[PDB]
Design a protein around this ligand. Structure first.
Ligand SMILES: CO[C@H]1O[C@H](CO)[C@@H](O)[C@H](O[C@@H]2O[C@@H](C)[C@@H](O)[C@@H](O)[C@@H]2O)[C@H]1NC(C)=O
Lengths: 219, 217
């Protein structure tokens, strides 16, 4: 039993936007659906709810800018109008047992960006030590994911097989107006000659998919 | 119109310790008890801990306890573990079909001071082909969060051309990590030789330095 949001993307202000909550393993004839959002670095904010009969109710601030509809036995749309930069956020849907937004079943979220800037895909550069021996028995390796817009980018290591010792940093907005993000991992020095370490980078908004192998630079 | 005020915004406590998080509503919640508590970590949706003021959500551990009624509610986390480092929210339901989240509370696990492991990374030849040079300094697995990075280029202290990012507190060892990125034009990078990262932190009796020379392995 799960939910998954989709449709979060970059649009210019005033462009209408529709998000979709796709559900699996429970019935919309039995459960309600809540929508919640969260601006970058901010707290959770309730938007509204649709009940089993399709009746909808919203936060006082919505003011008719938002609408909810059940479009099939497994899908629920959130339609948004008069969008501005204030509406840039990650949007969640959640299974409602009742009208209370208290529930243990949430989607992962879909990210919405309201901006007139254009999409740009990142370059991916190695963060590599000069030597296998530069820092003793442990080495740090990394990937610099530079100059993209909008959010998000995801990074994993070795196709998800390597998670321990991984630190993927929050994106920083550069003065250029593009984001940059670094991801690093600490690994044993003693096998750097033969073990492969690859960062798997994805920037879905630009259809950018890059695997970068990182190792110490040769002299 | 109605306010949900969550306090404190931040609290620090040791493993084995306890914290109390408070929510005060300007108006009684629905049925006097429709108040829920959530835990949230970076990049994830919130996880339900408590609902109806005091009912433990299936699969949340016993050390989370909710209490209260009307307009005043408390979440008490006892026997703190590293995994409890997170942001916590209350959520009230109200007459008129209204839900309101509290502003949130960040819970930090207070642990012994630990020095950072520092690493430095020169710009890649790939990047240099497009006119910019990024130099990165990594400070790995330290506590507490505060740390200072000073870049030096041929012993000139850099100012205004670096940006930092910090991870959320680690759920296993309660440490932070930080990356600092020094951005130079390729032209500037190639006019200088010695690149150094100097790191100041409570776990270090004096600042530690890592350096490299451009084009010298
Ligand atoms: C805890 O939620 C359950 O009890 C409440 C109150 O009696 C009830 O309203 C819930 O019914 C659901 O929500 C209402 C608004 C309608 O949409 C109804 O069709 C829903 O089933 C009930 N939840 C469940 C899952 O039975």
């Amino acid at each position: 039993q799960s939910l998954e949001e989709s449709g979060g993307r970059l649009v210019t202000p005033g462009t209408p936007l529709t998000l979709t909550c796709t559900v699996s393993g429970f019935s919309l004839s039995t459960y309600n659906i809540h929508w919640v959002r969260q601006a970058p670095g901010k707290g959770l904010e309730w938007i509204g709810v649709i009940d089993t009969g399709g009746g909808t109710y919203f936060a006082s601030w919505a003011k008719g800018r938002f609408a909810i509809s059940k479009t099939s036995s497994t899908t629920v749309d959130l339609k948004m109008t008069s969008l501005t930069a204030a509406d840039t956020a990650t949007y969640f849907c959640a299974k409602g047992f009742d009208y209370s937004a208290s529930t243990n079943l949430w989607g992962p979220g879909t990210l919405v960006t309201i901006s007139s800037a254009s999409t740009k895909g990142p370059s991916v550069f190695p963060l590599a030590p000069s030597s296998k021996s530069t820092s003793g028995g442990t080495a740090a390796l990394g990937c610099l994911v530079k100059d993209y817009f909008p959010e998000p980018v995801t990074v994993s290591w070795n196709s998800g097989a390597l998670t321990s010792g991984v630190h993927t940093f929050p994106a920083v907005l550069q003065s250029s107006g593009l984001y940059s993000l670094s991801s690093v991992v600490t690994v044993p020095s003693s096998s750097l000659g033969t073990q492969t370490y690859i960062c798997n980078v994805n920037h879905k908004p630009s259809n950018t998919k890059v695997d970068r192998r990182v190792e110490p630079k040769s002299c | 119109e109605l306010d949900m005020t969550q306090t404190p915004s931040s609290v620090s406590a040791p493993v084995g310790g306890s914290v109390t998080i408070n929510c005060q509503s300007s108006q009684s919640v629905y049925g006097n008890n429709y108040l829920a508590w959530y835990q949230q970590k970076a990049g994830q949706p919130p996880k339900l801990l408590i609902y109806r003021a005091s009912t433990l959500a299936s699969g949340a551990p016993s050390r989370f306890k909710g209490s209260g009624s009307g307009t005043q509610f408390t979440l008490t986390i006892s026997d703190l573990e590293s995994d409890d480092a997170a942001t916590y929210y209350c959520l009230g339901y109200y007459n008129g079909v209204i839900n309101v989240f509290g502003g949130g509370t960040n819970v930090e696990i207070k642990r012994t001071v630990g020095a950072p492991s520092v690493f430095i990374f020169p710009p890649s030849d790939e990047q240099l082909k497009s006119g910019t040079a990024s130099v990165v300094c990594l400070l790995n697995n330290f506590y507490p969060r505060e740390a200072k990075v000073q870049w030096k280029v041929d012993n000139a202290l850099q100012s205004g051309n670096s940006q930092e990012s910090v991870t959320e507190q680690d759920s296993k060892d309660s440490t932070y990590s930080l990356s600092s990125t020094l951005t130079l034009s390729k032209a500037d990078y190639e006019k200088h030789k010695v690149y150094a990262c100097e790191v100041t932190h409570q776990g270090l009796s004096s600042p530690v330095t890592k350096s490299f020379n451009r084009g010298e392995c």
